[PDB]
Amino acid sequence: VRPVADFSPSLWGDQFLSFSIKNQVAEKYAKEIEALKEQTRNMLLATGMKLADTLNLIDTIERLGISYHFEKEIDDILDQIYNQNSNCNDLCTSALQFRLLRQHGFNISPEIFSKFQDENGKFKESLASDVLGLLNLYEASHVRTHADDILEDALAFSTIHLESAAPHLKSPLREQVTHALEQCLHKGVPRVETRFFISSIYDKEQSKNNVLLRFAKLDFNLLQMLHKQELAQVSRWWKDLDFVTTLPYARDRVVECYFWALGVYFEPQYSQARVMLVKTISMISIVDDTFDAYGTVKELEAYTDAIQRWDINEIDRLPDYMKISYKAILDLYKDYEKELSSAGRSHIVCHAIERMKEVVRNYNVESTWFIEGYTPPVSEYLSNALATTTYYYLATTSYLGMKSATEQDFEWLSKNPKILEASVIICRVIDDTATYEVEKSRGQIATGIECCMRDYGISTKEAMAKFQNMAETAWKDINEGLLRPTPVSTEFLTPILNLARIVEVTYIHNLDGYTHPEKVLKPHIINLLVDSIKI
């Protein structure tokens, strides 16, 4: 109750509080899109297309962010391509084939890349002057599984040569290439990459397809109207409880939390789900700050205890300010119960609650360790720190609003499947690398990186690197987790992959973009939620 937190306040003020949809623009946009959608569908169903032209078609529709209209169409075509083991075998076309099929769960063999390597298993340097090939190899290299050692040098090979070529390339290729080196496609946030592709690249293409371009622009701008509605409604919900003033020790980041929810899914069909999810993110952010930047060892115990018991009767046992958090929390979940009552999917809230209880227990442990000055071995540290990412919790939460999610889906998730552990590890390891210094100067001894130095007996940098490996292993596990046959439908894997993406995108350049949103998140939020795409 006496630590002075240097949390910058919300960048946004009330600018998101009111949004009145221009129903006439909306209906106009919607009507034209039906037509462009249909034309685009026929583009996909065109018969007798070259392989390379079909893959570029699907890639472009995917990068323009409109692929969610043609899930069946795009699937059938990739299925067909997979089962054909094909005979268009230039580097460009092969790497793109590999990437698209793999991203869709088709376990295409990495043997396709042998024709491009010497007898030493190294990529032929004679390819260093095929820039489009190098670019697609580069993107493909980020979808490695552990079975794909054949690609172990694709990333360094393509990188060194893209770097060397980039400055002399025409536009917008030069810009595409430069952006890819900064942010690969597979690990970027979908809305972020789509907005960059439409405005910065495709729109400046000499060969651009006008139908697809108009389509992409109207759709993005139309969905954005929805997100703005969601954000506004969520902004009033955040307002009508005023933790801004009530709980001034906490980070005020509901816009940043909505961005997180939007990264997990952007499709209109997940509107209910996004709104539930972002509420949870906001709330848990509060609890996190509570344990970490204000409440006392004594108060936290009462808090954890109450959370585990989960009944209002316990409020009185908590100091006045924790009564606020605590009731809001309990209400939020009764709200969820109401929203889901309509469809009789109300029972499923308990899975999310159980995961929240878990997070809090581990927050309390993390606190005990801080007081005692305990520096666990990495094993023990991880056994506790993984859940305090909140990622088991958010992933579970992300299913609430999803109308098709069943009990078997939650029963899979509850077992900590490998794809979820990987996403959780990526978040943990990235947050620890980014926040090493600030937490260490603030009297932290239980820091993940400290445990790693003290445990293995290695420098701050040697520990930084081991953590990077864990994240890289983790991505290979995510990539392997998407391959068919999948343990649950792909729709329930994507949010977990997306959770991994958001942490990569937000901690880019190794900085806590959530706590300090100005450098990185702000531009994203502006491009996704403030500015429309100029038609």
Ligand SMILES: C/C1=C\Cc2ccc(cc2)NC/C(C)=C/CC1
């Ligand atoms: C970096 C994250 C963990 C630390 C923390 C906890 C909870 C919040 C913020 C910070 N909420 C939003 C999330 C899930 C951000 C990524 C997780």
Ligand SMILES: [Mg+2]
């Ligand atoms: Mg924290």
Ligand SMILES: [Mg+2]
């Ligand atoms: Mg950390």
